[PDB]
């Protein structure tokens, strides 16, 4: 991810 | 993943101060918050970031992205509603  | 709803208070940062953490990833329609000991994380996206303006809670940000570890020393990135509300208004009005 890195993105929520 | 908690069964019940979590909450957390956190300070807003300036984009410039945020760019020190993220560099050129921080765009104009983005607003930073956190790096305060708490942190939004996977599953929080789409969620609200609110500030009380004149006694009422107002949608300031939308949980967007951030540290892949959800580091509490790294500022989370939220969608800047202020720069998107015009699109919202236009879309509500036409549908």
């Amino acid at each position: 991810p890195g993105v929520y | 993943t908690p069964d019940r709803l979590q909450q957390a208070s956190l300070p807003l940062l300036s984009n410039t101060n945020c760019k020190k953490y993220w560099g050129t990833k921080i765009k104009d329609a983005m607003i930073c918050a956190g790096a305060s000991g708490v942190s939004s994380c996977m599953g929080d996206s789409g969620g609200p970031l609110v500030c009380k303006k004149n006694g009422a809670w107002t949608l300031v940000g939308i949980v967007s992205w951030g540290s892949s570890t959800c580091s509490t020393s790294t500022p989370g990135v939220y969608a800047r509603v202020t720069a998107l509300v015009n699109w919202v208004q236009q879309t509500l009005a036409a549908n």
């Binding site: 993105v3 | 993943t1 908690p2 069964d3 019940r4 709803l5 979590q6 909450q7 957390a8 208070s9 956190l10 300070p11 807003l12 940062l13 300036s14 990833k25 765009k27 329609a29 983005m30 000991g37 708490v38 942190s39 939004s40 994380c41 996977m42 599953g43 929080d44 996206s45 789409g46 969620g47 609200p48 970031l49 609110v50 500030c51 009422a56 107002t58 949608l59 300031v60 940000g61 939308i62 949980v63 967007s64 992205w65 570890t69 959800c70 509490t72 989370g76 990135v77 939220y78 969608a79 509603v81 202020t82 720069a83 998107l84 509300v85 015009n86 699109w87 919202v88 879309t91 509500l92």
Partner: protein, 131 residues
């Protein structure tokens, strides 16, 4: 939310939970009125999903929650998937929410509203409390 606290049940009436038909909570959202929901465009919401309102404990069975069907996903055309900029989508509900003591709208700011750095604000959700 890593390092957060449990909320008072019903204290954040606009908070919703987007769940797929498997029951899996994948994103959060905010009610802006009985027919519109705001969430992140990157959540990749489809009309096959469902919006849950008036929920506090995703594991409770005695909760009088509102399972709402999505009529249309309105992804902001400025949305840039490569930069994740302008990360917003409106969800037009086919079945309008029923506002109550646990279900209501959050206010939206003026395009001109100011939110100074230093201002303590609040974020909510069912995201990981630990990575």
């Amino acid at each position: 939310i890593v390092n957060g606290e449990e909320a008072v049940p019903g204290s954040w009436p606009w908070q919703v939970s987007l769940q797929d038909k498997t029951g899996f909570h994948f994103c959060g959202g905010s009610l802006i009125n009985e027919n519109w929901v705001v969430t992140a465009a990157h959540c990749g919401v489809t009309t096959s999903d469902v919006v849950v309102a008036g929920e506090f404990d995703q594991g409770s069975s005695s909760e009088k929650i509102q399972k709402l069907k999505i009529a249309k996903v309105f992804k902001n055309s400025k949305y840039n998937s490569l930069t994740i900029n302008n990360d917003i989508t409106l969800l037009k509900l086919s079945t309008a929410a029923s506002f109550s003591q646990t279900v209501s709208a959050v206010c939206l700011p003026s395009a001109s509203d100011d939110f100074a750095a230093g201002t303590t604000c609040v974020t909510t959700g069912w995201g990981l409390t630990r990575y």
